[model samples]
Target: GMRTYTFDQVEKAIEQLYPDFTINTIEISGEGNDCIAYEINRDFIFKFPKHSRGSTNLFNEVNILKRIHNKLPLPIPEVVFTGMPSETYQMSFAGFTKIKGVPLTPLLLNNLPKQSQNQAAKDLARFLSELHSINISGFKSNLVLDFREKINEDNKKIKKLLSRELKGPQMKKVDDFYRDILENEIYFKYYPCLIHNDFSSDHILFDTEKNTICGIIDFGDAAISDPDNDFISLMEDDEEYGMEFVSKILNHYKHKDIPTVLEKYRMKEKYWSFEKIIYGKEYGYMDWYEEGLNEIRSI
Candidate 1:
């Protein structure tokens, strides 16, 4: 079941855990389907899981993150504190050293100088190649995601979502995607590697002052999966880094396969908005539903 906590509850939980630690100020730093994050002194974050699914998986994600901490050049979370499930707070919560910087939202990214954009593309490429190349064969955890079957289940929900409204091309688009995904081989062409399953503007932290990417966050969705799945988010958002951005990564990535990657991305990326629309509908966050619908009309 999903649950939520108030700012006061979060602060109380922090106080119970870190009583001796000074508390300058606390603010809601971020909220997602998985957890609600609170910032203390703008230097550290505490996340309380909102659902049992996220609550239980916190163990796996934290373990995997700690195992891979020093392998990359950038900062990723290796939690500083883990507050065990307790009475006042029913679910597990954790504290992490903050990865400070603003999200590289599309609008902010679009206006940056050309040099900044170029450097960002290069920086992102390095991170991807490093993360993707990890020989996770011995990691010994269930952090892998079966992306093909995953998309298949998503389309099944989408089919139901579409039944209530809109027909014709939209229906066919999803149907076509369903067949192409399961009945064909284009999407299954990659050797599996650990992937940042949610790689995108939101998870990527950009340092505005330095004009470079500071860190990548949210390994909650990290998994051993098709590497192509990570690229889907890069190519999908409005005013996103376009073909050139992906190309720059391909140019630098050691495991480059330009044609297969691009062709697969072409199909899956088109449905990114549909994925958003489905999430919006499920969660009753109608704003995503409206913007997601608008994305289709524009593209």
Candidate 2:
């Protein structure tokens, strides 16, 4: 088993490894069970492992990134080098060129021009459409076996957890969603494509000057999965902001029209929203729950 190391220790390792590099500062970027980014020098990032139990490793991320780099329309950060996992740091680490832009969060989106925002959404849709068109025949499925199975299983788990935590109208809403999932399993099918499983605004970098997606960071959760799972970020985010992006992106992707179950999908999304809160609480990620509450209130 790999042990964890302090940020200072990781910094020291970087300094020792790259003598030419000067560490001006280090701040935590987004994190997950697989990795954490130590933003250093405003132009470079160091990735460290987060998962200790599973196949999610930083080395694997390097391999995947290398394979997908040229295929991506936007410039994804190219991996500079990978460090070996040691006893002091249980997981491997890697370095990459940092993207120079802001995350397309609500605050940032609000600041941009409407035309810019609309164009960004369209670009994102086209980018995602291109991304989904790729084949992941050689890649591995880390957390789940297949797309539909994963969605079905997650729906089951989300329902169970929500039932325990919510009651009355909320509970009934969740129950109804679970029933819908069961009923619609056959009717509303999904195609397994290459999906950036964690395709939230936080993971996306936007270039306001050019009004385009500059770069995307963090592939720790990228995988071969259903496009609907990727669509969840759009579904669960602020409606106006999310719909702005979702509508454009879907238009670019040009998938076959899903049957007239838009309301049911929206209901399923609310159920997902509830599950997101519960999961965030379990992980001690109160910030996620806070954001969830805000979005739910907005809806």
Candidate 3:
């Protein structure tokens, strides 16, 4: 289901949170994972989780935000308030300081001038370095799952999904990919850290006017997992951009030998990409499955 909160509904929620500020506009912006986010004003945004995802783990996201919000040089949505699940908004929710920026999607990358593009790349790398620098020993014990385990589980799901939609050589290509991953099992040995499991351009909002990352959002997928897992999204745009981003971030971290880490990273991307595609399609994410398949075929 989609969010259907009216301007009035958002207003009422705002009134509940802040009695001092005068409210004028509350606009719907985006919806995902059964949640609706409203731009409450120039400075704040409200997010209400849908019933499908219980409030149990919702606070986990909030907890992480509180812990890491000030450590990074980049902007993160600061939690302004939180609310209990209710009838209008079926589940618990929170408010964040609104970010003034644009997502670093293909469009932004394509439109930027050469100098700006290089700078954006460097800034993003620095952002990741600071983010990945956080210690995860405090967080890992509680996360029940890691990237490798998730991929392995997703692999099984993909096999079942592909078995139903594909057969013969097409399916075998996918199967062989899995077989290769199973044989190598390289990702398991890497150190697990606080990986922004959804570290994609879309999750980032850049202040194009300022030439800096205005904000980073969406913590629903944050996890303590293999560091390389964070780079898995690179396969989406070919390994070049992903490798480039990783390279810059590692350099900023003062690592002397990132080439070796990157070598293993390339292999993980292929494995994770296939697992993601197959599972996505099986789970009715047809668009993702199709897009991933196209990328793989291109390579």
Candidate 4:
């Protein structure tokens, strides 16, 4: 639905949006199936949806960021300007003051000292605790769809992909995962809360020198959902930090019934791995698919 734009076209759009802002340098900070982001003037972050489907959420994302920017403890994107769609671009764009810090990739986390790693895990747990505690009454109007419906849709997608891409033991592993999720359906029952649906290392920001989480970004996937869904990514990273990091997070989590919640979260994590593999294959993300496959085998 959306067409790709050359650097020149993006440049023109930027100029139209900010007539007086001089552009000294531009670099593609991130790009994926959903969106492409550019670091402009070494200070601002500009993001454009890669397709019309992606464009659907642009306004919602901006509004969410604006609403929750001050509510959370960590720094998040601060909207500086919003742009209209024009001849050069099909989707509206937004620019924000970039939050400073490197992506807390697995390698970066793994390389930290054990004490730093432990602290980082605790920080992340506290961040999620605060994030999930935010009142969603005002934001509920903006979130239209049932989150469980999305989960069902994703399950269907994974089944379809598994039918086509897997067989024998591999397929059985996925089937067993689905069976487990279905059997433990009661564990997933919880009051809906605000959650960072894509709470992966990539969206987390870290100040390695200070051994702390400096910021969190990419709120585009924020939603009202089962709070345990946030812990799915934590389970996805056992190889990078072993179970110690996950253990610390669970220990730090304020929930009184974490053991029961974590049981459901583990199932969600397995289901998500299948979803990731299917998504990666469809999107030509070989590394992502490989990672998912590795996760599946381990499970």
Question: What are the TM-scores, per candidate, against the unseen true structure?
Answer: 0.80, 0.72, 0.74, 0.79
RMSD of 4: 4.2
| Cα lDDT listed for each candidate | 0.77, 0.66, 0.66, 0.75
lDDT of 4 at 215: 89
lDDT of 3 at 159: 64
Worst lDDT run of 10 residues, candidate 2, spans: 255-264
Highest TM-score scorer: 1
Off by over 4 Å in 2: 1-7, 15-35, 50-60, 85-90, 141-145, 151-180, 186-188, 237-240, 258-268, 273-299
Clashing pairs in 3: none
* Backbone clash numbers for all candidates listed: 0, 1, 0, 0
Q: Can you give the lDDT of residue 119 in candidate 2?
A: 76
Which residue pairs show backbone clashes in model 1? none
lDDT string for model 3 (236-299, tens) is 5542355555555556556665655665667755655575586455446677788776665545
Give the TM-score comparing model 2 with the true structure, all chains together. Answer: 0.72
Backbone clashes in candidate 1 total 0
Q: Can you write out model 4's per-residue Cα lDDT over 1-299, one digit (the tens) per residue?
A: 44576777778887886888788888898886777888988999988877665665566678788878888878888999787765544457888898788987788888889888888888888889988898887885557445456566766777776676666778776766666565655654677888887787878888867879998888777788777767756566553344556777878886677676556665565566767787677766778888887887775
